[PDB]
Amino acid sequence: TQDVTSGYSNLDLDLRDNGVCVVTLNRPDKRNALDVATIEELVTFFSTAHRKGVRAVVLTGAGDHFCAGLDLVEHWKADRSADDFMHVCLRWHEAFNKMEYGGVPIIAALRGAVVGGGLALASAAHLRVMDQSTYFALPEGQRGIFTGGGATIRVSDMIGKYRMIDMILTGRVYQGQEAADLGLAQYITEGSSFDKAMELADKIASNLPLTNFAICSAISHMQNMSGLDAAYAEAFVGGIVNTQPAARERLEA
Amino acid sequence: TQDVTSGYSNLDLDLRDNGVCVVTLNRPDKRNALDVATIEELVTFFSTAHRKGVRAVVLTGAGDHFCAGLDLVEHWKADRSADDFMHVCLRWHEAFNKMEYGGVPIIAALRGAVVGGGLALASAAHLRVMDQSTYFALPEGQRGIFTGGGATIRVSDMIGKYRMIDMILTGRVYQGQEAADLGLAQYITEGSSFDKAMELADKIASNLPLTNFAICSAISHMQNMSGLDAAYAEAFVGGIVNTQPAARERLEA
Amino acid sequence: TQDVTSGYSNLDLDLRDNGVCVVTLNRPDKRNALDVATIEELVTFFSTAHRKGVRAVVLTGAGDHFCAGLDLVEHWKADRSADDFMHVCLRWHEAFNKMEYGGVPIIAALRGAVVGGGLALASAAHLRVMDQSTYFALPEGQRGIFTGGGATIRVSDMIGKYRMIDMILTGRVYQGQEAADLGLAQYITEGSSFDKAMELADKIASNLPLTNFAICSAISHMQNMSGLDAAYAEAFVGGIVNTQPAARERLEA
Amino acid sequence: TQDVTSGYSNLDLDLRDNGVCVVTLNRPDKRNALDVATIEELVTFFSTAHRKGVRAVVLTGAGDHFCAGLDLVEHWKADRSADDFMHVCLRWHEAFNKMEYGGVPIIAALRGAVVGGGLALASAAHLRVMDQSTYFALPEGQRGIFTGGGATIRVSDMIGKYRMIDMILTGRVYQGQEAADLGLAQYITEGSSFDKAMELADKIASNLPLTNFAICSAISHMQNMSGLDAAYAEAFVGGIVNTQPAARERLEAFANKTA
Amino acid sequence: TQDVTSGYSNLDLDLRDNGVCVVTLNRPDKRNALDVATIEELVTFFSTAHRKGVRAVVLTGAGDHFCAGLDLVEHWKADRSADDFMHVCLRWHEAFNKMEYGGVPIIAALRGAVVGGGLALASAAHLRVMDQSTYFALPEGQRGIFTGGGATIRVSDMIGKYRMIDMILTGRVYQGQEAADLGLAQYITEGSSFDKAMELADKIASNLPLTNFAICSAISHMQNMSGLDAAYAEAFVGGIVNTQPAARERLEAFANKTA
Amino acid sequence: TQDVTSGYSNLDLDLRDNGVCVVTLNRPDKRNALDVATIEELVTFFSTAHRKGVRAVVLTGAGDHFCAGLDLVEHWKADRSADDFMHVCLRWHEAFNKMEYGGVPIIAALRGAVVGGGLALASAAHLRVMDQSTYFALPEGQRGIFTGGGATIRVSDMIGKYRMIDMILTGRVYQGQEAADLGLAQYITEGSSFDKAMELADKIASNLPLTNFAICSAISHMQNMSGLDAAYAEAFVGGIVNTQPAARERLEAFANKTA
Numbered sequence A, B, C: 001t002q003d004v005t006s007g008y009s010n011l012d013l014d015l016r017d018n019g020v021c022v023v024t025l026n027r028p029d030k031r032n033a034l035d036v037a038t039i040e041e042l043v044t045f046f047s048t049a050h051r052k053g054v055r056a057v058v059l060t061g062a063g064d065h066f067c068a069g070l071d072l073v074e075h076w077k078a079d080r081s082a083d084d085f086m087h088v089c090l091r092w093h094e095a096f097n098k099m100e101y102g103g104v105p106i107i108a109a110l111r112g113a114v115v116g117g118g119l120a121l122a123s124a125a126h127l128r129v130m131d132q133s134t135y136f137a138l139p140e141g142q143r144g145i146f147t148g149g150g151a152t153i154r155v156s157d158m159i160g161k162y163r164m165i166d167m168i169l170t171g172r173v174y175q176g177q178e179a180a181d182l183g184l185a186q187y188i189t190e191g192s193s194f195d196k197a198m199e200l201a202d203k204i205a206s207n208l209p210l211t212n213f214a215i216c217s218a219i220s221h222m223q224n225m226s227g228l229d230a231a232y233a234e235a236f237v238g239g240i241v242n243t244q245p246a247a248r249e250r251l252e253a
Numbered sequence D, E, F: 001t002q003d004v005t006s007g008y009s010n011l012d013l014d015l016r017d018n019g020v021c022v023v024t025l026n027r028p029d030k031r032n033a034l035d036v037a038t039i040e041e042l043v044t045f046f047s048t049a050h051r052k053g054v055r056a057v058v059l060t061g062a063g064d065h066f067c068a069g070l071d072l073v074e075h076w077k078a079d080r081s082a083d084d085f086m087h088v089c090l091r092w093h094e095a096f097n098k099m100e101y102g103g104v105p106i107i108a109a110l111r112g113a114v115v116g117g118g119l120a121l122a123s124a125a126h127l128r129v130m131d132q133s134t135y136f137a138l139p140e141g142q143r144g145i146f147t148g149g150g151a152t153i154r155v156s157d158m159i160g161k162y163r164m165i166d167m168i169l170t171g172r173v174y175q176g177q178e179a180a181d182l183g184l185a186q187y188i189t190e191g192s193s194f195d196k197a198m199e200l201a202d203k204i205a206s207n208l209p210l211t212n213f214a215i216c217s218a219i220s221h222m223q224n225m226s227g228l229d230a231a232y233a234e235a236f237v238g239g240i241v242n243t244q245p246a247a248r249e250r251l252e253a254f255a256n257k258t259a
């Protein structure tokens, strides 16, 4: 429906009949580099997806490469001051925080380069599916750049603080089974990562809206707390989710 | 001694001469599903084990399956309100928090199904030993249920926040070497997981009570703090543990 | 230069022309066991390395073994009170916290035994390179000792809280590819770990001082915060690092 | 300007030439109770105020009472499920978190009742100015319910965890100088709270945008961290704010004696 | 009832018909010093009070002094090792954490000395009522020792980290209105603190059990989190408490004008 | 002694026979503005004071004003890059964190201006004694800049997050009894703040070294944790401090009646 798919210049959207929305980064000529305009579009989409009824998102990059990172051309031309760039980083965080804590399951279908800000974007999804062409790296460090978008936060949760520091400090590249085993992606396929992502998304979309909402917002929040306080919060999350009428019906079913 | 082993209807206890207590979930006809009464028995046992002198616990399920999770039959019949269930979840947390932070080493000897609330229980032990029949999953999500018992907290520490979200979101199953390598169990055996657990427990029971106490309570607490404040707490833990007379004797020995 | 290399009795220093400083634990006759005097030397070196211009550190042990841990001979002879030892532990933390958050990249070239306090020291480096002779363990637990130096904090980040508890509780030893895959070291070599560490250090030293500084201090700090507050801090770190003139020059370059 | 004050209904907006925007809850016949429509307007306004160039906000309620809290009528009628209401609460948090961490100085000009969700709203502003008619309460318990809008977090920061528990647990009312001294408001006036709020806002709007942004976002974030980690973050905030070109003229003013 | 008040020795218990239970430390000849036996009784009582249906607790000390703290005699005599005493402290925490996070409203009716561990005990209650004879101190330093029972945590929440450090570092004594204003007690009376505590408790007991449970457990937990994460948890607490069937009658009372 | 008071320039040090060391900022003609050289001396002194045996510190400023904050002249002239200044701020934190968590009791004897970084410095001490000439402010905004030295952390702990935001956001000045009551200083005197500080310090120095160390380091660390985790840490702190041999004589003093 146009109410979900229109309004974006750098994203191509395709809403399926079961509520799965394919969100395709659409600047293939620039390897889907993320400029401020695209980030704002991500903020808008992920701020409203839940309320608009989107049941799950399959996030992919148009072309052979998922995302080449922050748009360094725009950055270089903009000749940003430290405060201008700090502000740009907060917009990246607003988009990625809405993805991580927004409650709509996001499954990234990766191909080719998932680098720098592109790895930050991939990390903001709940699930990642990589194929035989996919590789991960934070190569900007070699050119004096500190990766943003919360990669230092999310990639540390994915592969461990020390492997994350190794990646940004050395520009080390991971791919194939090695990358999956490291924790960069939960799924690796010999075929189409898009098709595998759709299979996962369709199954997820068939689950209860509230249950998926809790799974895709409460767990990240609880990981930010002491486990002794998270326990208490979890009891309230379980109280609401597990006593919903639709849930009771499924148990009976 | 009856002072340690009597008083439980759903648990079968066997106290060995070296202080190792075998705690066996004993509802094999229901695949050791955890109902409120069993949870209360776990709260009682783990609230008092340290003060009663138990040196280590080998936790296992009677039968071919460790634990089938929360008792969904009791749940369905009870037709719980959100607040009734929130309260039931707090009891699960009281039992599992007493296990994790209580200071008595717990070694789970797993077999067959370790699912849903059963994985939450297994996660509350310090060590897990799995065998060739053991498998892990959080299958309730497919039926609209959010897993409780702190699995979102402990399993995230075990396998990573994103693999934990993947498990609850998709119902994904892990077993064999793959599960051990993922972080679901530190030990995998080709033989008896109970026998391997006993070997581990006997060695642990031969160590100093206070040292084991600190290992099995302080580390979980320190992980809940900033590493800069945990450092300070660790200095005091080390100060008390490492200057005990029994410790000095062992160095000399 | 003497301004960087002189002043240490238990450490041997070698400053290379590109700012890489080799810091060699130098008590090979005692397997580089760490006594209070050596710890104080580590506090001094790592408190001043950044301001003295050191660009990266290659940390190694003289001889066939990296570090045998806390000096148990000094400990036993000192017959320390709980408060005396608590104070000794705070000095270990001061040294290791200066290593972890000080902003100077530290690459440990490991060989042989990396045990007890020696594993705590290795863990305080950002990167670890192990060879075919390297092994890791926390064997003091068997003799009633709780490992200090923040190993419970850092090793948990490296291999997971539960694998860390397993190591201290059982004295379990890891080595070879198994240890690297577990997360004990990011690099494993069939040749010289010192040579591989130097290769890494030389590449790191060729990067921008400020970028390396942020990578080697900000990430550890952000991991101590809720991801929602770390996001904000990261924006300011990115703002300062990514708008430095030297960075702009490298983009143009 | 039309791009800042247009499109709203429950809120009345007035952008002054110096960048101060007066945001008035405009449902006086309902004592400005916050229903879902009004919360969504607050989410919209505070999500974009900074980027739209608003320099400061004076938040007030039309009529004799600032805000009576959650619209209990809409709530009772909707007969909400626990998940329906949890979702409503998250919208409140989206609005109030944007107010607290958004970087735009907000000064609440209070009058009369500042109760329940109304106190949650007042607490989400950086500064509060109360007058002699202002009174504070968390009467939720009386209705048999729990507060929301982050009142348990913000009011505890304002008056202390134990005084916040006392307020919701007993329904205790605070007003006058006692309320100001307790920490419910930094300013209390014998006259118009609105005029005092405008005075504060005009002075704030005359300061540097970046500096106000940091003050109105960084401090709340640093309070959520261990002080040892917050110190490191503070250094980066100061590094960016304290070396901005716009501050050098003022630093020079001190160098001599013009300042 | 016998299933609530039986089996104790160091504590005297009186369960009133409205569910208010009066818990009295009963060792007046020792100024109610807390020895290990008394702490275990507090652990037992507060671990089960909620499930036993206690609606509110009025905690008080027999005699002229609320509680003189750790039983120094038992302590000195036991000549405890550092690990022995660390274990004793953990039992204190088990009792006091159950009081703070247990969900049962606790109102302390203070008189005379509320010192050392005695202040730790008073701090573990949600509300404190002091009279004109009440005084507060953390004289541990004088004995050459550190406080316990979570006083460094709770008293800092009550009066501020720096005032808490001042108290233990100098042995400074607070009393009267000054103590109340400092944050040591929310209520101060010219008469009987016990009667004022009972008034508070009876009103609290007339509110909804679930609502009081949330107020007396959720707020302390949310203070331990970043405010951004606490907000999410608050939404779930409100979702459950605010949609409970028992609250609808009261919401209706407001819908009209009976309320 | 020469091994404690030698080698400094910007600081004047006087070690008294009872172990109390008077640390005086000695740049009165500059109102004791903290430049990089002075911060490095504070880092050096507080990094070693505990191991050197200093029992307590009385921190004061030469002249009529405690400390005017960051040396704005050096700052303006250096025309620092954001990273240069971030690094300067980290040095400030190294000094102030060593003061707060170092374990050596610090008592600030204030006079006149305690502003900007000067308040950050005063806030890093455990106790503050103000006189009738003392006034507090965070006038950074006026200079178009942000505070530093952890003022956003420590002052928020002292007077409340919202009063701290008010101070930097409006430049509001506090003084007299009002400042003391707000939480800016635990002690206010009609006479000499220095003499009152010395009285406090001498009494503190007469207590046990280990006990003071814990009080002056453990409490700040425990405030950075969830209260449930802090309780466990407190038990270990108490285990070590409360069983120290040196405290038994004092415990015995109570056993009888000599105490």
Ligand SMILES: CSCCC(=O)SCCNC(=O)CCNC(=O)[C@H](O)C(C)(C)COP(=O)(O)OP(=O)(O)OC[C@H]1O[C@@H](n2cnc3c(N)ncnc32)[C@H](O)[C@@H]1OP(=O)(O)O
Pocket: D029, D030, D031, D033, D065, D067, D068, D069, D070, D071, D072, D073, D074, D089, D092, D113, D115, D116, D117, D118, D139, D140, D143, D145, D146, D147, D148, D149, E238
């Ligand atoms: C995210 S969790 C949040 C938890 C909470 O905040 S619960 C609410 C707490 N907050 C409270 O419990 C505050 C409840 N309200 C009051 O105590 C009083 O209304 C006031 C003290 C605020 C003002 O008194 P007054 O001047 O006498 O006005 P009133 O009581 O006669 O009410 C006038 C109208 O305002 C209406 N009104 C008034 N308050 C609301 C409302 N709150 N929702 C809906 N309609 C309302 C009232 O119904 C009337 O509507 P009408 O009959 O159509 O003319």
Ligand SMILES: CSCCC(=O)SCCNC(=O)CCNC(=O)[C@H](O)C(C)(C)COP(=O)(O)OP(=O)(O)OC[C@H]1O[C@@H](n2cnc3c(N)ncnc32)[C@H](O)[C@@H]1OP(=O)(O)O
Pocket: E029, E030, E031, E033, E065, E067, E068, E069, E070, E071, E072, E073, E074, E089, E092, E113, E115, E116, E117, E118, E139, E140, E143, E145, E146, E147, E148, E149, F238
């Ligand atoms: C988890 S860490 C906790 C750290 C702390 O709390 S340390 C203790 C702090 N707390 C303190 O340091 C408080 C110390 N006590 C006092 O200052 C006073 O006793 C009071 C101000 C509380 C009351 O004064 P008063 O009415 O004159 O009573 P008293 O001082 O004559 O004492 C009467 C009896 O109570 C006894 N008594 C009194 N206090 C204790 C006790 N505290 N342990 C044991 N027996 C005690 C006292 O010994 C006497 O016993 P008796 O000789 O057999 O008749």
Ligand SMILES: CSCCC(=O)SCCNC(=O)CCNC(=O)[C@H](O)C(C)(C)COP(=O)(O)OP(=O)(O)OC[C@H]1O[C@@H](n2cnc3c(N)ncnc32)[C@H](O)[C@@H]1OP(=O)(O)O
Pocket: D238, F029, F030, F031, F033, F065, F067, F068, F069, F070, F071, F072, F073, F074, F089, F092, F113, F115, F116, F117, F118, F139, F140, F143, F145, F146, F147, F148, F149
């Ligand atoms: C880590 S981020 C920290 C952020 C901040 O702290 S920013 C600063 C906040 N802090 C402030 O904004 C405080 C600014 N200072 C004042 O408001 C006043 O100087 C006082 C109220 C503190 C004292 O007033 P007064 O007795 O009239 O002294 P004065 O204003 O005549 O100044 C006398 C000398 O002290 C010098 N002086 C005075 N303050 C400084 C300084 N602050 N840096 C350098 N030189 C200074 C002043 O320049 C003069 O130098 P001179 O012309 O060579 O004789």
